[PDB]
Scaffold this active site. Structure first.
Site, PDB file in Angstrom:
ATOM      1  N   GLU A 253       0.632  -1.396  -0.186  1.00  0.00           N
ATOM      2  CA  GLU A 253       0.071  -0.102   0.141  1.00  0.00           C
ATOM      3  C   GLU A 253       0.731   1.320  -0.099  1.00  0.00           C
ATOM      4  O   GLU A 253       0.319   2.243  -0.759  1.00  0.00           O
ATOM      5  CB  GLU A 253      -0.901   0.069   1.268  1.00  0.00           C
ATOM      6  CG  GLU A 253      -1.851   1.298   1.143  1.00  0.00           C
ATOM      7  CD  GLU A 253      -2.848   1.029   2.446  1.00  0.00           C
ATOM      8  OE1 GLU A 253      -2.787  -0.001   3.270  1.00  0.00           O
ATOM      9  OE2 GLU A 253      -3.715   1.961   2.553  1.00  0.00           O
TER      10      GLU A 253
ATOM     11  N   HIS B  55      -7.201 -10.487  -7.684  1.00  0.00           N
ATOM     12  CA  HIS B  55      -7.049 -10.914  -6.311  1.00  0.00           C
ATOM     13  C   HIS B  55      -6.270  -9.635  -5.767  1.00  0.00           C
ATOM     14  O   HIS B  55      -6.780  -9.024  -4.729  1.00  0.00           O
ATOM     15  CB  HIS B  55      -6.185 -11.995  -5.865  1.00  0.00           C
ATOM     16  CG  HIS B  55      -5.975 -12.252  -4.361  1.00  0.00           C
ATOM     17  ND1 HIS B  55      -6.539 -13.345  -3.528  1.00  0.00           N
ATOM     18  CD2 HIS B  55      -4.898 -11.581  -3.381  1.00  0.00           C
ATOM     19  CE1 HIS B  55      -6.058 -13.145  -2.381  1.00  0.00           C
ATOM     20  NE2 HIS B  55      -5.146 -12.164  -2.268  1.00  0.00           N
ATOM     21  N   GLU B  56      -5.128  -9.134  -6.264  1.00  0.00           N
ATOM     22  CA  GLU B  56      -4.357  -8.298  -5.747  1.00  0.00           C
ATOM     23  C   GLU B  56      -4.924  -6.778  -5.912  1.00  0.00           C
ATOM     24  O   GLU B  56      -4.860  -5.842  -5.244  1.00  0.00           O
ATOM     25  CB  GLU B  56      -2.897  -8.046  -6.374  1.00  0.00           C
ATOM     26  CG  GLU B  56      -2.090  -9.246  -6.259  1.00  0.00           C
ATOM     27  CD  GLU B  56      -1.842  -9.825  -4.955  1.00  0.00           C
ATOM     28  OE1 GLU B  56      -1.975  -9.072  -3.987  1.00  0.00           O
ATOM     29  OE2 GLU B  56      -1.189 -11.100  -4.665  1.00  0.00           O
TER      30      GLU B  56
ATOM     31  N   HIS C 182      -7.160  -5.905  -3.188  1.00  0.00           N
ATOM     32  CA  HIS C 182      -6.380  -5.408  -2.012  1.00  0.00           C
ATOM     33  C   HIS C 182      -6.122  -4.000  -2.084  1.00  0.00           C
ATOM     34  O   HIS C 182      -6.390  -3.042  -1.335  1.00  0.00           O
ATOM     35  CB  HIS C 182      -4.885  -5.983  -1.701  1.00  0.00           C
ATOM     36  CG  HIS C 182      -4.956  -7.293  -1.139  1.00  0.00           C
ATOM     37  ND1 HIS C 182      -5.966  -7.817  -0.258  1.00  0.00           N
ATOM     38  CD2 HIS C 182      -4.257  -8.349  -1.381  1.00  0.00           C
ATOM     39  CE1 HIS C 182      -5.738  -9.089   0.221  1.00  0.00           C
ATOM     40  NE2 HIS C 182      -4.596  -9.435  -0.516  1.00  0.00           N
TER      41      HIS C 182
ATOM     42  N   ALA D  79      -7.685  -1.160   0.524  1.00  0.00           N
ATOM     43  CA  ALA D  79      -6.704  -0.166   0.995  1.00  0.00           C
ATOM     44  C   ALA D  79      -6.931   1.172   0.807  1.00  0.00           C
ATOM     45  O   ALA D  79      -6.875   2.051   1.591  1.00  0.00           O
ATOM     46  CB  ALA D  79      -5.186  -0.492   0.971  1.00  0.00           C
TER      47      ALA D  79
ATOM     48  N   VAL E 192     -10.288   0.546   4.404  1.00  0.00           N
ATOM     49  CA  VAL E 192      -9.745   0.179   5.399  1.00  0.00           C
ATOM     50  C   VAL E 192      -8.717   1.643   5.773  1.00  0.00           C
ATOM     51  O   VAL E 192      -7.798   1.967   4.588  1.00  0.00           O
ATOM     52  CB  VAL E 192      -8.815  -0.828   5.273  1.00  0.00           C
ATOM     53  CG1 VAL E 192      -7.864  -0.878   6.682  1.00  0.00           C
ATOM     54  CG2 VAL E 192      -9.556  -2.191   5.157  1.00  0.00           C
TER      55      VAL E 192
ATOM     56  N   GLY F 289      -6.227   4.555   6.972  1.00  0.00           N
ATOM     57  CA  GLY F 289      -4.859   4.244   7.447  1.00  0.00           C
ATOM     58  C   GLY F 289      -4.212   3.185   6.527  1.00  0.00           C
ATOM     59  O   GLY F 289      -4.512   2.871   5.603  1.00  0.00           O
TER      60      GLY F 289
ATOM     61  N   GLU G 141      -7.933 -11.367   2.990  1.00  0.00           N
ATOM     62  CA  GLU G 141      -7.753 -12.437   2.026  1.00  0.00           C
ATOM     63  C   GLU G 141      -8.988 -13.160   1.484  1.00  0.00           C
ATOM     64  O   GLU G 141      -9.066 -13.425   0.353  1.00  0.00           O
ATOM     65  CB  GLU G 141      -6.713 -13.281   2.668  1.00  0.00           C
ATOM     66  CG  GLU G 141      -5.341 -12.902   2.976  1.00  0.00           C
ATOM     67  CD  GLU G 141      -4.813 -12.159   1.762  1.00  0.00           C
ATOM     68  OE1 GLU G 141      -5.107 -12.199   0.643  1.00  0.00           O
ATOM     69  OE2 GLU G 141      -3.787 -11.343   2.178  1.00  0.00           O
TER      70      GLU G 141
END
Ligand SMILES: CC(=O)Nc1ccccc1OCc1cn(CCNC(=O)[C@@H](CC(C)C)C(=O)NO)nn1
Ligand SMILES: [Ca+2]
Ligand SMILES: [Zn+2]
EC number: 3.4.24.3
Length: 386
Positions: A95, A120-121, A124, A128, A132, A134, A152
């Site tokens: 991130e 998948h990546e 993320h 991020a 999520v 921070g 995951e």
């Protein structure tokens, strides 16, 4: 000195650069990664993005100035060239660099395709940026394994995103579940406490099954769980996890759901982008595209922005959708998803083949003073009108 060596290595391994979305989506790639594949990965990201925002209900970055204002994706030629550059976990997102790393591969080197790992990546990156707050690894959501199954398991889940059918289960993940001993299936509580330190990482698959169980059978809990994360509400998240972990009847439903997922293994597909994205769609006047979408989706206060990419241009059409009286956020979510997918299938029924490139999502649920459902709705597609 050391500057020439790092740059020489990146040139040898990653000589090619492909730029999309006005410079905010950058693929750095080995010279054996085909341009057709590069194009597929771009449209795959939009499929994943559309389903993610529908579920989370937010599409505004939580922080200002973070590195992931530009997403960089480094795709090496092969597993060997990936390893040397760091070992084989398939892929990784970082991130604070806004960058993920993975590699092209043959079917003899992995059961997973590059587009599956990319999906998948990319999830993320979406987590991020939009869900999520921070940085990963910091704060209370990165204590006590709070988000390990979630990060995951929902990345495996959203890798199954489609264009017009929502999120579908992936054959290879179901194969992992199906091949496991029945006796060794994780309980709901065990999955929700799994961590990267576990004896094996079957939690990725049981975590996927939790996400999919909530998606199909208890979307109110999934929406509430996502809202607690979005709001960095640790107390609300912990109350939900404890209610899921302590209710034997909930585990029974989750176990039943695992078995239904296994039973779908034989006939499951691999959600990957259609070849229809790669077609030469041809010119269609922009105003007609926007007008036809706005009418089919019943959108008001519509604005559009155009972006330039390596191989084509795109448009992002934003509008407000005000429907009928609200049946609650959760019943509304389900109806909105069905209406939006039905619109996407109608616009592609007949017409410009460019309509087969459309992805759509909705965000920011509310009700008017007259108690009408209200959503911000977003379409994205190819633009062939310069
Ligand atoms: C640094 C940072 O910001 N990380 C980060 C940020 C946001 C979300 C998740 C993040 O990393 C999670 C992770 C996962 N692994 C374990 C190693 N990889 C894998 O095992 C792959 C497997 C998958 C391709 C099937 C993975 O799961 N690939 O993702 N280590 N950090
Ligand atoms: Ca973040
Ligand atoms: Zn991951």
């Amino acid at each position: 000195d050391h500057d020439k060596f790092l740059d020489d290595a990146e040139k040898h391994y990653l000589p090619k650069t492909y730029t999309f979305d006005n410079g905010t989506f950058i693929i750095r790639a080995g010279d054996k990664v085909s341009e057709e594949k590069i194009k597929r990965l771009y449209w795959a990201s939009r499929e994943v993005k559309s389903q993610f925002h529908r579920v989370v209900g937010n599409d505004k970055a939580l922080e200002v100035g973070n590195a992931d204002d530009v997403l960089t994706m480094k795709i090496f030629n092969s597993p060997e060239e990936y390893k040397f550059n760091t070992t084989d976990n398939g892929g990784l997102y970082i991130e604070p660099r806004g960058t993920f790393y993975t590699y092209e591969r043959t079917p003899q080197q992995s059961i997973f395709s590059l587009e599956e790992l990319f999906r998948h990546e990319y999830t993320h990156y979406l987590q991020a940026r939009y869900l999520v707050d921070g940085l990963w690894g910091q704060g209370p959501f990165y204590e006590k394994n709070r988000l390990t199954w979630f990060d995951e398991g929902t990345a495996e889940f959203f890798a199954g995103s489609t264009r017009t059918s929502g999120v579908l289960p992936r054959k290879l993940i179901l194969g992992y579940l199906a091949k496991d001993k029945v006796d060794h299936r994780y309980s709901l509580k065990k999955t929700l406490n799994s961590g990267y330190d576990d004896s094996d990482w079957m939690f990725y698959n049981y975590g996927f099954a939790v996400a999919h169980y909530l998606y199909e059978k208890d979307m109110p809990t999934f929406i509430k769980m996502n809202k607690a994360i979005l709001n960095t509400d640790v107390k609300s998240y912990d109350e939900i996890i404890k209610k899921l972990s302590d209710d034997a009847n909930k585990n029974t439903e989750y176990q039943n759901h695992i078995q239904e997922l296994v039973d779908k293994y034989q006939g499951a597909g691999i959600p990957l982008v259609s070849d229809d994205y790669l077609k030469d769609h041809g010119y269609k006047k922009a105003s007609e595209v926007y007008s036809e979408i706005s009418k089919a989706a019943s959108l008001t206060n519509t604005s559009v922005t155009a972006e330039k990419s390596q191989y084509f241009n795109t448009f992002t059409l934003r509008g407000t959708y005000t429907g009928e009286t609200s049946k609650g956020e959760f019943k509304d979510w389900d109806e909105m998803s069905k209406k939006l997918d039905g619109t996407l299938e109608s616009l592609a029924k007949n017409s410009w083949s460019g309509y087969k490139t459309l992805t759509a999502y909705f965000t920011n649920y509310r009700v008017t003073s007259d108690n009408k459902v209200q959503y911000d709705v977003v379409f994205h597609g190819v633009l062939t009108d310069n």
